[PDB]
Symmetry: C3
Subunit: 398 residues, 3 copies
C-alpha cells in the first residue's frame, strides 16, 4: 500500500460508493455488510481511550504543579469559552445569510450542582471501568501531583516506589500510543465503510430545505476554521498550514467517527508528534473532548433558527443573545459521543421559548434529526480542531 493518504482514497470512494447505493434503496445493504467494518475501526479506537487518557495525564503531572496546570487551566478554559461564544454567533450570521425555513413544517404526528460534584469520582476504579472521562481527568491529575511530591520525599524508599509506579503508568501510556499507530493502518477501510453508511442513509435525504440548512452549517464550519482558527494561530505565530498538515489524522478521524471522545487517542498522538509536552496536551485535549464543542455551538445556533423560521417566530429582533449564551452552555453540556448535540439542542430551544412538546416544533426537530449524522461529521471535526488549536496556542504561551 501507498502512503496514509489512503484515508482520502477511501473517503472519496466511500462517499461515492455510499451516496450511489443509498439512492437505489440499498440503505440496508450497506448497513448489513459495509458498516461492521466501520464499527470495528471505532471499536479499536474506543478501546485505547480509557488507558491513554488516564495514563498520559498522570505522567502529565510531571510539569510544575502550581503553574502550568493552574495557568494552562485558566488559559485553556478562557480559550474554550471565547471560541464557543464566537462559534454560535457565526452560526447565527449563517442562519441570517441563508434563510433555512420558508415552508410550513412538514406534517404533524440535569441539576448542575449535581454535575460539578460528579467531577470528583467516588471510586477511581469504578470511573475507569465505566468510561467517565471527566472524573478520570480529576483523579489522574490528583494522583500525578501526589507522585511528584512523593518523589521529593527525604525517605528514598518512598521515592523509589513512587518512581516505580510512575514508570509503569508511563509504560502503559506509551504502549497505547504505539497501538494508535497500528489502529491507523486499518483507518482507510474504516473510513471507507463509515461514510459509505452515512451517505447511503442520510445523504440521500439532504434535499430541499435540508440542503439549505446543511449548506448554512458547513459554510459556517468553514468560516470557523478560516476566520477563527487560521486567524488565531497566525496571531500566535504558529504556522496554520503546518498545523493542518500535522492535525490531518485527527481531523479526518473526528469527521468520520463523529466521536470527539473516540478520536482522542489519535488526537493526543498528533499532539505528541507535533512536539507538545504531555504537561499541556494530556490535560487540554481530554477536557476539550468534553467541554469544548465549537462546531456544536454553531450547529445549535443555525438549528435554533431553522425551527424558528419553520414556525415563523421572529426570533426576538434583539434578544437572540439568549441563543448565544445558552448555546455555549449546551456546547459544554454536550457529550463527546456521536449524537449528543442534537439531544442538547433541546436546551437552547426552550431558552428561545419553543419546547419539543408543541408538536410542530417536534415536527421540524424530527426533520433536522434525519440528517444529523451528515451534520455531525463536519461539526465533530471542528470540535476536535478547536481542541488542537487551543492546545497549540496555550502550549506556545507557556
Amino acid at each position: 500500500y501507498p502512503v496514509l493518504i489512503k484515508i482520502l482514497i477511501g473517503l472519496i470512494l466511500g462517499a461515492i460508493v455510499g451516496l450511489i447505493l443509498g439512492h437505489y434503496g440499498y440503505a440496508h445493504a450497506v448497513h448489513t455488510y459495509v458498516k461492521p467494518f466501520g464499527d470495528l475501526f471505532v471499536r479499536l479506537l474506543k478501546m485505547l481511550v480509557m488507558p491513554i487518557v488516564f495514563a498520559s495525564l498522570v505522567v502529565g503531572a510531571a510539569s510544575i504543579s502550581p503553574a502550568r496546570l493552574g495557568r494552562v487551566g485558566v488559559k485553556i478554559v478562557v480559550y474554550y469559552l471565547l471560541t464557543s461564544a464566537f462559534a454560535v454567533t457565526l452560526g447565527i450570521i449563517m442562519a441570517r445569510l441563508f434563510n433555512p425555513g420558508a415552508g410550513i413544517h412538514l406534517a404533524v404526528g440535569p441539576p448542575l450542582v449535581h454535575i460539578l460534584l460528579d467531577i470528583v469520582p467516588t471510586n477511581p476504579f469504578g470511573a475507569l471501568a465505566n468510561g467517565q472521562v471527566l472524573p478520570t481527568i480529576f483523579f489522574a491529575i490528583i494522583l500525578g501531583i501526589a507522585i511528584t511530591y512523593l518523589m521529593n520525599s527525604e525517605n528514598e524508599k518512598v521515592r523509589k516506589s513512587a518512581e516505580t509506579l510512575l514508570d509503569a503508568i508511563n509504560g502503559l501510556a506509551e504502549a497505547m500510543y504505539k497501538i494508535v499507530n497500528g489502529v491507523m493502518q486499518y483507518a482507510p477501510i474504516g473510513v471507507f465503510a463509515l461514510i459509505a453508511y452515512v451517505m447511503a442513509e442520510q445523504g440521500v435525504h439532504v434535499v430541499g430545505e435540508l440542503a439549505k440548512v446543511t449548506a448554512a452549517v458547513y459554510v459556517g464550519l468553514t468560516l470557523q476554521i478560516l476566520l477563527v482558527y487560521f486567524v488565531l494561530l497566525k496571531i500566535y505565530g504558529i504556522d496554520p498550514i503546518s498545523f493542518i498538515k500535522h492535525a490531518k489524522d485527527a481531523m479526518l478521524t473526528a469527521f468520520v467517527t463523529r466521536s470527539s471522545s473516540g478520536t482522542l487517542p489519535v488526537t493526543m498522538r498528533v499532539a505528541k508528534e507535533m512536539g507538545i509536552s504531555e504537561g499541556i496536551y494530556s490535560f487540554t485535549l481530554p477536557l476539550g473532548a468534553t467541554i469544548n464543542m465549537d462546531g456544536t455551538a454553531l450547529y445549535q445556533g443555525v438549528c435554533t433558527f431553522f425551527i424558528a423560521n419553520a414556525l415563523g417566530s421572529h426570533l426576538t429582533v434583539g434578544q437572540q443573545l439568549t441563543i448565544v449564551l445558552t448555546a455555549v452552555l449546551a456546547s459544554i453540556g454536550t457529550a463527546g459521543v456521536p449524537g449528543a448535540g442534537a439531544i442538547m439542542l433541546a436546551m437552547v430551544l426552550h431558552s428561545v421559548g419553543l419546547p419539543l412538546t408543541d408538536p410542530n416544533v417536534a415536527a421540524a426537530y424530527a426533520m433536522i434529526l434525519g440528517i444529523d449524522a451528515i451534520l455531525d461529521m463536519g461539526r465533530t471535526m471542528v470540535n476536535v480542531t478547536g481542541d488542537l488549536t487551543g492546545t497549540a496556542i496555550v502550549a506556545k504561551t507557556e
Copy 2:
C-alpha cells in the same frame, strides 16, 4: 489560616448557624446552598477509600504471614465482639435509666416494607477487578491479603527473575498506597468548610426536631456513647498502657470526620492516616481498620439497644423481665450486619426488633420507628464517631500486644 482546629471553629459555627436557620424554616435553603459544600468533602474522601484500602493492605502483608495476620486476626475479632457486646448492654442500661416512651405512639399510617452462608461466601470475590470497581471493601480485604502474601513468598524464590518482577509490583502498589496518604493530607485542608456545611445541614433539618421524647432518646444515646468512651475505651487503653489522652490527641481528625460524615467507610482514608501517623505498622492497621469499618460497629450496637427500648416503651411491652439478652445478642449481630454507610444502623435496627418480637408490619411499631428515623442523622453522628473510635482503640490495643 490558623491550625487544623479550624475544624472545631467550623463545627461550632456550623451547628449554631444550622440550628438557627432550620428553626426559621430555612431547611431547604441550607440544603440547596450549604449542603453541596459538605458533599464535596464526602466525595473527596470516598474517592480515596478503594485505592488506599487495597494498596495499603497488599503492602500491609509485609508482616509475618502465619502469625501477625493470623494472631492479629483472632485478637481483633475477639476484641470487636466484646466491645460490641458491651456497647449494647451499656445502651440497655441507659434506656432503663432514661425511660424513652411514656406517651402513646400517636398517629398511625406511614409504613415500611440475607441468607448468612451467601454472605460468608461473598467475602471471596469472583473477580477482584470487579470488587475494586464496585466499592465492596470486604472482598477486597480478602484478595489484598492473598495477593500481598503471595508477593512475599515470590520474593524468596530461587528464580531471581520472579523475585525482581514481584518486588517491582509491590513497589508500584506501595507508590499508589503512599500517594493516597499524601492526598488525605490535602483533602483535610477542605475539612473545615466540609465540616461546617455538613452539620449546617443536619442541625438545620433534624436538629430542629430533637424535642420532647425525641430529646430523651437522644440524651440516653449520647450519654451512653460518652460512657462507652470513658468506661470502655479510656479504661481499656489505660490497662493496656497506651496513653488515653495521647490517643485522643492523635484520633482527633478521624473522630471529627466520622462524626460529621457518618460514613465509617468514607472516613477510612483519614482513619488510616491517623493510624499511620501514630506509628502503628501497616501490617496491623491496614487489616484491622477496614475490617472494623464493616464489622465493628460499637455506637450502632448502643444505638440499637436504646432504640429497641424506645419502641417497646412506646407500645408498653415489658421488654421481657429477664430475656433482653436477646437484644444484646442480636444487636451484636445487627452491628456486624450494619454497613459503614451513613444510614444503615436505623435500617438494621429492624432486625433486633423482630428478635424481641415487634415487626415493622404492626403499624404502631412502624409509627414509632418512623419517629426515630426522623432524627436519625442526629443519632448517626455520635454513633459513627464511636464506631470509628472502637476501630482505632482495637488497633492500638492489638498493635501493642503484637
Copy 3:
C-alpha cells in the same frame, strides 16, 4: 495429610456419601450443609481467573509477534475445529450404538422459551479494557492482553531508553501479578479435597438418584463416547506427535479433576494454566491457547449435543434424516464454539442444534424430553467439561511441540 491424591479420596468418598444421602430424600440436607464447602472452592478459583488470564498473556507476548502468535493461532484454531468436528461424529456413533429413546416422552407441561454473529465478532474488541477486566469477559480481555504485550515488546526496542525503562517496568509488575496468582493456585488446591468432596456430594445426592432407565442409557452413551474421545482422539493424537500420553495424564490430573467437579471450564482456568506451566510449556503458547480453548474449544459439549439431539429425536420417533445428520455435526461445532465456560450452557446451546434438525422447544413434546435431559445435566456436565479442558491441554501440548 498425605499426597494430593486426597482429591481422589474425597471424590470416591463424596460420590458414595452423596449417592446414599440423595436416595434417602436428603437432597436438601446436602445442599444446605455440604454444598457451601464446594462453593467456597469454586469461589476461590474464580477469583484468580481474571488476573491470571490478563497478566499471563501480556507477558505471553514475549515470543515473536508475527510468527508464534500468528502461527500458534492458526494451528490451535485449526486443531480446535477438527477435534470438535470429530467429537460430535463420535457422539452420533454412540447414539446409534446405544438407542436412547424407545418409550414415548410421557408428561406434557413444563415449556421453555423460543445472537447476531457479527455483533459477536465485533465484541472481541473491548471498548473499555478496564470494564472488560472488571466484568469477567475473557475473550475481549484476550484480545487486549495480546495487543498490550506486543506493544510492550516494541517499546523495549525503542531508541529512547526512557520509554524502554518504563515499558520494562510495566512488564515486570504485570509479571509480578501473573506469578503471584500461580503461587495462589498452589494454595487453593490444598482446599481442593474438601471442595471436590462437597461438590460431587451434591450432584450425586440430587441428580444422581435420577440416573435410572432411559436416562441411564443416555448417560452411558455419553460417558463411553467421552472415554473414546480420550483414547481414540487424544491418546492417539499425542502418540503421533511424540508427546507421552501417560505422562500427559500424570501432569494434567489436577486440571482434569477440577474441571470434572467444577463443571466450569473457565473457572478451572487458573489450575489448567498452572498445569501447563509445570509441564514446561512456554507462556507464549499456553497463555493464549488455554483461555481461548476455555471459550472456543468445547469437545465434550460437541459430543454431548450430538448424543442429545438423537435422544430427543428417538423419543419423538423422528428418523433423524437417513443421510443429513451432518447438519448436526456442523451445527454442534457452532454450538460448541457458542457454548460458554460456565457450568451449564451446553444444555442451553443444545437448543440451537435442535432447531437445526427441525425440532423446536415450542413443541410441547420436545420441551418435555429436553426437560428430562436437563434433570440429569450436571451428571453429564462433569464428564463433558473435563473433556472440554482435556482438549485444550492436548492442543496446547501438540501446538507447543510443533513450535
